[PDB]
Design a protein around this ligand. Structure first.
Ligand SMILES: *[C@@H]1O[C@H](CO)[C@@H](O)[C@H](O)[C@H]1NC(C)=O
Length: 261
């Protein structure tokens, strides 16, 4: 397993761009692409996971563990009282839950559990964060850095604080890797807090559908119109791969053959 590192507390646009490229390159199957967009591996690859080590306020760190097959965050660890403190979502099942603990903490000599007492669905995180929608949760570099400090090394924090941290980190790491559009929103707003627009949220919700549509396209034509949203919330109807391609960073794994270029 490899670790991609990113210091959100002392950074620049160009450093975040490099981080995104590194994350995409570690996540993707080296051999799979459709229409020149790299695709994630199936769930039976030899290297199943990846670590993303984030640094933030007061140089405190959190490590995210991501599944390569779909880039979902499985849990995170923080240095706490000399221990690898591992936090896993409450629906991560049996032996994979064992694997997440062992993967997060392998080089560490001591560990302690602090479970995430909920699952990773956006609806769940929004409920825990006490917001109507993650549209209401500002994103940004400084926010990410500060949120890291509210969790890492802290003996106590509320589920709300955690869920807001997770909304920010999941979108700025996994969703940004999946979507160049979302990466570009971060970079455009690099020096400020921003409210994610309707296109960010819509892309996040439709990644699977988009990945299927692109994979199953013949000579660039999507089998059915894809109903998405523009940045200002208006309806965006996509008919061909080239219309959506510039927004894509990674495709979800989809079995079968596709036009690779
Ligand atoms: C960021 O890091 C650079 C290089 O180590 C350092 O010179 C600078 O003071 C840091 N920025 C701040 C204000 O933390």
């Amino acid at each position: 397993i490899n670790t991609i590192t990113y210091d959100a507390g002392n950074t620049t646009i160009n450093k975040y761009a490099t981080f995104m490229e590194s994350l995409r390159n570690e996540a993707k199957d080296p051999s799979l692409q459709c229409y020149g967009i790299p695709m994630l591996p199936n769930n039976s690859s030899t290297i199943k996971y990846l670590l993303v080590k984030l640094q933030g306020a007061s140089q405190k760190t959190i490590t995210l563990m991501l599944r390569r097959n779909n880039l979902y965050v499985m849990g995170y660890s923080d240095p706490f009282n000399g221990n690898c403190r591992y936090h896993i979502f409450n629906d991560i099942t049996g032996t994979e839950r064992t694997n997440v603990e062992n993967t997060l903490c392998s080089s560490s000599s001591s560990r302690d559990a602090k479970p995430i007492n909920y699952n990773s669905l956006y609806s769940t995180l929004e409920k825990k964060a006490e917001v109507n929608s993650r549209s209401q949760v500002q994103l940004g570099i400084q926010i990410l850095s500060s949120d890291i400090g509210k969790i890492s090394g802290q003996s106590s924090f509320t589920d709300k604080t955690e869920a807001k941290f997770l909304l920010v980190a999941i979108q700025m790491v996994s969703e940004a890797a999946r979507f160049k559009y979302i990466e570009n929103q971060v970079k455009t707003n690099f020096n400020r807090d921003f409210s994610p627009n309707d296109k960010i949220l819509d892309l996040e919700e439709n990644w699977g559908k988009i990945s299927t549509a692109i994979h199953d396209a013949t000579n660039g034509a999507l089998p059915k119109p894809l109903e998405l949203k523009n940045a200002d919330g208006t309806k965006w109807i996509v008919l061909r791969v080239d219309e959506i391609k510039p927004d894509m960073g990674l495709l979800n794994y989809v079995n079968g053959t596709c036009q690779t270029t």
